[PDB]
Symmetry: D3
Subunit: 265 residues, 6 copies
């Protein structure tokens, strides 16, 4: 999923192109599009602006949050490549999204995703107190609770996103697609590896509950509302409460196709 700096700037230029048309057609939002997209020369400027505003609270206002976010980005440019891949993901996968700018401007799953990246960097930086603040602030604002120590790729779509929980020791690989109220949850009362490992290509239906240190193999599909307690073989479909292998997706990387069907028998 690596991205040539020229690719990133191609993505940024597509968005700034949308922004101009948006400002014109909608005067009530023209000043908004201008301040967040049109005044900026690249995706990281915009992003730090968007998140600062979303995450602001009397405890820590937008202006103080943009400083943290931008320091993170100077330290780890790849975080911006991640965001662009995420934006690319939802446009291609979500038949409801038809502009590159919408994930960036509006979609809270995308925002919670990019907010976790900051929590994550802060975590690795041993700035855990701050990372925790942000974790819960994101939980309250978007209804999405992702622990900072989680390890998540890019090209990730969190559609609708409300109610998503991802725990401390989880791993989510690239090109993964996840729907509302999905839990990548723990088990037990002790510290230790106890959260799921979601491999490349996985698609997780809405309301699915995947618990423990178990694996979902690549190109696997978890049905909406399943409760997964054992590891799922690559390129299999799992489903039910608790889930069992039910069949096999009709494409190699279900995350890219968003087909929700399954047999459950």
């Amino acid at each position: 999923n690596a991205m040539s700096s020229e690719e990133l700037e191609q993505v940024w230029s597509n968005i700034k192109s949308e922004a101009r048309a948006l400002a014109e057609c909608e005067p009530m939002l023209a000043s908004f599009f201008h301040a967040t997209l049109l005044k900026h020369e690249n995706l990281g400027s915009a992003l730090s602006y968007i998140l600062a505003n979303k995450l602001a609270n009397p405890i820590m206002p937008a202006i103080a949050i943009r400083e943290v976010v931008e320091e993170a980005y100077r330290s780890d440019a790849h975080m911006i490549v991640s965001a662009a891949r995420d934006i690319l993901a939802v446009r291609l996968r979500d038949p409801a999204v038809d502009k590159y700018s919408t994930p960036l401007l509006y979609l809270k799953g995308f925002h919670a995703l990019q907010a976790y990246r900051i929590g994550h960097w802060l975590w690795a930086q041993d700035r855990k107190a701050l990372a925790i603040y942000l974790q819960n602030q994101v939980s309250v604002a978007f209804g999405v609770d992702i622990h900072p120590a989680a390890t998540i790729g890019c090209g990730i779509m969190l559609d609708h996103a409300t109610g998503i929980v991802i725990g401390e020791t989880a791993v989510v690989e690239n090109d993964v697609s996840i729907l509302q109220s999905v839990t990548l949850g723990g088990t037990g009362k002790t510290s230790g590896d106890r959260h799921p490992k979601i491999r490349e290509g996985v698609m997780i239906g809405a309301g699915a509950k995947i618990l423990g240190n178990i694996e979902v193999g690549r190109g696997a599909k978890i049905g909406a509302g399943s409760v997964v307690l054992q590891s799922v073989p690559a390129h299999t479909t799992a489903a039910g409460v608790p889930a069992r292998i039910v069949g096999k997706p009709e494409s190699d990387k279900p995350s890219l196709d968003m087909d929700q069907h399954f047999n459950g028998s």
Copy 2:
């Protein structure tokens, strides 16, 4: 379809409750007064409340009221819908004992009314503003309703956290939907791919309904169920995935709220 007298009675009941509310809880008095007592009809009170609820530094309450009020002038039936939606809430949910309760406090009711503003903006080809509000309601209330959706009235969204309703979803009149319900899509392409729910069907908490499917008239969709194929009229569908495990006891489950399935 609600006559002026009916609209009025609804309003008359609310003012009545408010006068009492202001008297019993002084800290809220000025609130009641400004929101309800002050206005002469549901239309004026709603636009005020919706504005305040959608308010954002990007677009302030005072500015949102105008748009809301513009819609109510183009489509006055949005106000009637609202009235039916209050009534359904009071009739169906035993925890609510006032007409003012949904109008004032129940976000599911608010999300619903917010959607109708989006739905109108959509019709007007103001899709940008529609999209802005949709996601504003999502962040504010945890309810994600696409403005292209076609949603009737006499609709109860009880509790409402986590409700998702997609672009091509159709919900008809007199449908009750609980928290964590999805009327969801399938595939990566445009087109009919969201469920069409008919009159009177009741849907339990956490139900996931996926694809261009039908839930027929007066069907009951069991709580925590996942439905992938069309459910026939006046059956109870339940399970993961859902199977037809019976028939509702009443002709319109939505009005009864009986959560049981065989």
Copy 3:
């Protein structure tokens, strides 16, 4: 909870605050205003809630007065709260500090907010409780009716999506995950919500409906839809839930073991 126990918890919380303030300057004043500057937990908790629950309609400075009057009326609310902090610490592997629930965890926040509304409800100040209830719902995605009867030593992990209804009872030392409904059925008043007894743990997304009992030390699996009373010390799972085993210990709330079998046959088999 004894006096000495309560002050120890508060004393730990302050000590955590000092250290937190030295290691995170962005947040030092917030730690000072919220915790360090207070003589005990009641003062801290009201400050917190007031700030959490503030709104244009009612600003934090006013709410604090209400919470204060409540704690002044029913001090065991503060004892409750202390019990809930311990619970989170002991049961959440992801929680490593006493100050974390109190400061950050909306599950815990929504619970102590419930406690204010529940006290109002019993003071016949129902308009205010109904107001607080839906404010807690919009801000935290947690919907608890003030007339519910909820104990302490309770954990609401993650918490987004929780619904607890009017006639529900939740006894002491219970653990509940995100998207758990303790909801009602039918269109009429009267007992219609579940009664959750000591020692229960309910997994993510469980929907428990009607006026049924879930017995002492039982477990409800994630994604389970409970339509019937669950006997004490049994495990119930599936949609609709049935009994599929017994928990590994006597009070599953404390251990948070999420495992269940899809079949009681399977639980006897070993898998």
Copy 4:
């Protein structure tokens, strides 16, 4: 002022608006929600004022219903605003768009806010009028009592410091600058505040005290302390003020000639 010359000012303001938006993309939404969206001066002005007067205690959305109610009742307040706008455009060289006083000028905003208080005062709503008055003093540093009687074609340039007392009267086409007091004397109720006739111009920091008159076309010098009446068409200056000349114009207010000797 006629219907068609009121329309005129509104149409001009909107035009300035379409242009301001294009030239300042950061305020385009501001100009749009504030002017371009409204079909008349009254709408815009209620909008501006509501936003201007807003406080947690009473939000802009609420303040706006009050102000709208005052205008349904006495539409002349809207004609007075128009007049106040034309006064500033025409008499202040720093202002060159009608929209400017309407959007930005705090003196203009304190004047119009006084009219709502003044209206409320005659609607047996004195509690509310006193609330808005002191709210205006805090927000704009302009303290105007709502029982004061103030004409239109008034310019309050800069305006910080302006104090106008309860029993005071300002007639039409007057021009006041910053730091000017129209103040009372004594501990007792009753007439005790100045009466300022048509055409007068009062320089910055001038203090007019007691129930005295400043006559038609008289000019008060900046820094002046006026303790006795000033005959029409004279120039008064000094501490305490003395008569020292005659304005060169019949209506000093219109010309803003600050000179005295």
Copy 5:
């Protein structure tokens, strides 16, 4: 001011609040949260000051706790606020309710805010005092240094533009109007602000500069610049000022008579 003399004022203020609440529903909840719902003047006043000084840097809720710490340590701060309220009601003919200064009057709020700076400052919490000194100044256009020594039963009518510097003294029962300055001279520290004795009245726009004294019962005319001491029971006016007569009553502050002669 006795225990009951104080209970009384507070009752007068509460009973006014009941009627206010009744005749303007829009402000009913506000009258209730600030006055009706409180038990005494200190409670009311801390709530009010809290909401008046609020800022994202330090919100009302935190501000209230400091204010209360102060009243708890120095309760006469509250007595002062009573004497000050009585003063505005007694001397300002446009003020007919005790509740008015307390609720609305920026110069009265500014005055009490100083009291808290002045306690902070004597408590060596000077950074705070200073932070408040300038917060009072930005919100209310009133700038007084926490180090000033300002007594009791004081009225700051209108208040915009008032400036009272670090070494100023103002005694009990003084009345001051808008755009007045009790100001300094020079670039060095040391005593350099005016001493204003009991019963003095200072008209609008008066600038008083340097370590000079305005004697007991004196009157300072509006617009006056005062560069030298002013004897007690004397009227001073002009730029610069000269004594131009003697005030009509013993304490002009009580009577607010603004008249003076030219020469």
Copy 6:
């Protein structure tokens, strides 16, 4: 002011701010967010300014950007500000920390605010300039017109009520007290505002009007009304002002001697 001297003022501030945050735990994060986290005056100012000037119409974070853009384009604005800091520190016996002007003093904020407005004005962003001018008038009670030409080493002590009009000029090293007007005359465009040359001290309440000059090192006594040009190194006082004497120092703006004896 050199490069190496800027940095000692900054570090003197940063060093003060570390003492402050240890001494006042309620302000600790304030001090931290505003000074300590920054590695130069320009960053701290754009921060402080954005928050002092914040408004729903244009929020802090949006303002910071405009301000940073002004600094990039004309870095001397920052040296102006530092020279302004020093000015206060040395002239106002009430101030004993380099950080007091930067943090708290609105007359200094207004000055630096004017600077940005002045930049925009030159950038032909008059629209935004006018917005800021009046936002500063409301916020701080100081009205400075954007086209004004104002130097540095300038003190606006206290500063409530100051007015400085479109065609005014103030040269470096001027001290101006509260409620001072540099005002215009007439209803037509063109030079109608005072030019204050270097060194001038202007006492409180003074009003100076028309296109007139107050020469270098002259003193304008408080309450003065000045309608004719005032020679350099003279004291003018009275309503109206005449020459009353000569200041006792060569730059009165440094000495703050308010006495206009005569």
